[PDB]
Assembly symmetry: C3
Homo-oligomer: 270 residues x 3
Amino acid sequence: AVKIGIIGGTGLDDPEILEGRTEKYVDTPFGKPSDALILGKIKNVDCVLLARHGRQHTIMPSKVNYQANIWALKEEGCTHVIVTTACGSLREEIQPGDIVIIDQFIDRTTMRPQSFYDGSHSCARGVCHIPMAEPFCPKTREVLIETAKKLGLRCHSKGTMVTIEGPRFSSRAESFMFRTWGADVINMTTVPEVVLAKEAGICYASIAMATDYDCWEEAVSVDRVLKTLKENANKAKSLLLTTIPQIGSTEWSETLHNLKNMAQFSVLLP
Amino acid sequence: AVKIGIIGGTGLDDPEILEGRTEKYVDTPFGKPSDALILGKIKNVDCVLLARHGRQHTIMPSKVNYQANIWALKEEGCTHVIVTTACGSLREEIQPGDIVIIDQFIDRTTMRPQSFYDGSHSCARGVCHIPMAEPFCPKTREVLIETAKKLGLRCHSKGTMVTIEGPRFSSRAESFMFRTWGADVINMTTVPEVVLAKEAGICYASIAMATDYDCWEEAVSVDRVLKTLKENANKAKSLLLTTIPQIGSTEWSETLHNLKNMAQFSVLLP
Amino acid sequence: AVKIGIIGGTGLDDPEILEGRTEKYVDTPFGKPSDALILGKIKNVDCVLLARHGRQHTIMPSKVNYQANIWALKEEGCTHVIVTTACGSLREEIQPGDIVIIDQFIDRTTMRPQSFYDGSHSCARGVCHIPMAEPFCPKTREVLIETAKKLGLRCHSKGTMVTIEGPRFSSRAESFMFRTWGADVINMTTVPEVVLAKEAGICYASIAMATDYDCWEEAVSVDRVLKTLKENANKAKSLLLTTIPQIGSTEWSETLHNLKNMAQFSVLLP
Ligand SMILES: CSC[C@H]1N[C@@H](c2c[nH]c3c2N=CNC3N)[C@H](O)[C@@H]1O
Ligand SMILES: CSC[C@H]1N[C@@H](c2c[nH]c3c2N=CNC3N)[C@H](O)[C@@H]1O
Ligand SMILES: CSC[C@H]1N[C@@H](c2c[nH]c3c2N=CNC3N)[C@H](O)[C@@H]1O
């Protein structure tokens, strides 16, 4: 049995996506999640929705409690976590409105805890060095890619997301630099969300929505980002609604088992 | 009416530059500024001088209260902020003693608050994502460039400053790496000073003074830096004294208005 | 007279290396070192062994008290510090099991104090900007290289170590990126250990042991790393045992004097 956690990003966290909704505030050893968990279903699949920045978008990327958010979803029984994230495009072929099923990331954050194993919680003892060669769940990404195709949506099958600390946008020198490093899209929230999900043994995948071209001719601004999201939000919603039932009808025993082992054996006990 | 804030860097924070001086210690919601504000004038233009590292250079780059410094200057009514900064040259053509009117930056700092919108002060509510495509005020930079020319000074019209956390200087591997990234000069103080100034809607420009060649044949050292500054400090002083009156005689209504809007609309309210 | 401090890394901190051992717990102005200092000798040379992650490997790289460790060794009278460190290879020619006598580093850490001069301890007053052009002691590295040759060990005479924050391993995008930056090996502990040693005027050198190929065909994992170390640990032990007596029989007056001056003159007093 699967349970899909859904973390909604900027202008992409609509609760109306789930049926039979029930609000549930929880606490974790790492503090409170961004907002209440929204329990519900898409067809016959159990889901748990969570607004990354709070339902009123009051939490900046740097201060999102990534540990609490992932912990709460795991505790609720989530086997999978599919998220949405607005991002800047660093490639001409990735136009605003396009969806990018990212498969890699480049960390540029500097003040964020990236592990549950900080030796402050008995629930997570030891030193954990989680592998990051393949940060995102390939099976889920495959379904997302095929579903986007079935929906006729402009979608990119791979992409490297560079995550900056923020809250400021990048300078032009940084923008051009990230391009040389191989980054394809840019945001402020992928890391450490994807890292903690890995440590928790959860299949994590991300629906990245290009909302601008950053500044590498109209430079990025908050208004430009919100406008693009307003015009394209429906795509991510349709993708999630169509993808989730497919996930709930496939086999994951071996996939989840492997993630469990990788996470477990990454821990160095005293 | 304009009011020019001046932040003086290493060996480039001489109070004698202003006439009719009055010392004024202030406090801000983010703590105390590096030192007392020095109120004064250059010709008929009101200025406010502040020593970035304290008048006795007792504050390391990592611990400079950038938020308090910019906040205090804004509160005092500064419309512009022109600063001086010693830096290492990462380009053969930028010789020690040369002035570089930087137009871009590459952030390498890791433990510095870069925004006033940290949700801890009612005076700055919400999440602010300030644009950084053009970090420095083009109009002020233009006057600085033309003034340096009128003064016959070796001056570079553009440059990318990479700001490292410090207090240690860079290794040779890092030095060579920054060159490949497109950095032209290197220091430990541009970021987040320029970022916070932007959020405050202030026209910010920086007079960068090359004091060494870092280590990419004599490698950089504190003594080498202080010596070069001692020999070239007069240039930055003359540039400021000559530039400021010109700024006070030009039009800024539209320029300041645009910066005000950009800063304002960058904030996401609940 | 010399005294060699030895910091042992993952699976490379065996106390049996020293004769006439005596355990000594100490405290420093920056807190307690990772574990008790192990006083002893190799032939007629005084040594002080310290397990970087604690004798039971309970301290993650991000939380190792680098300041306390280096301070304790200096206080004990160490003139030299030779360490061992497991690392990932970013170059085809550097095979697991190979030793790399690194000469440069690229910092990718973000939450680590890198200086003793944080203005919180009277023992270290002022602002210190220590040079990092040559982070490692060339004389010690030379002896290590010649000794490895005499021992018939596969050893690389130079190498750039990129130190990531961790505890997570790098993504593939980051791995490939570090290669383009010029990094040859990768770990989570070189920085700021080498930086603080420099500020303390200690001759620091590092015996890096490649334990994997990171993920740029079997990707890195904790088990793979521990296995390689188990099979190759003896090499580092033999290298240390053979190198140290040679260090104790050579001249260091001028070398230590120069490091003393560089460290001293890097400090800016009020
Ligand atoms: C309201 S725009 C800032 C948010 N949207 C994402 C974003 C969109 N476009 C860009 C973002 N982040 C960085 N650079 C960009 N060009 C980031 O993750 C923030 O949470
Ligand atoms: C006393 S030299 C260190 C200061 N001067 C600036 C500097 C000069 N030259 C270099 C600096 N910073 C980094 N690398 C360099 N090569 C930095 O911003 C520090 O505040
Ligand atoms: C138990 S493997 C993690 C530790 N070993 C070192 C290491 C070995 N191999 C790699 C390490 N660190 C980063 N990337 C790598 N491929 C790091 O410094 C950690 O202390």
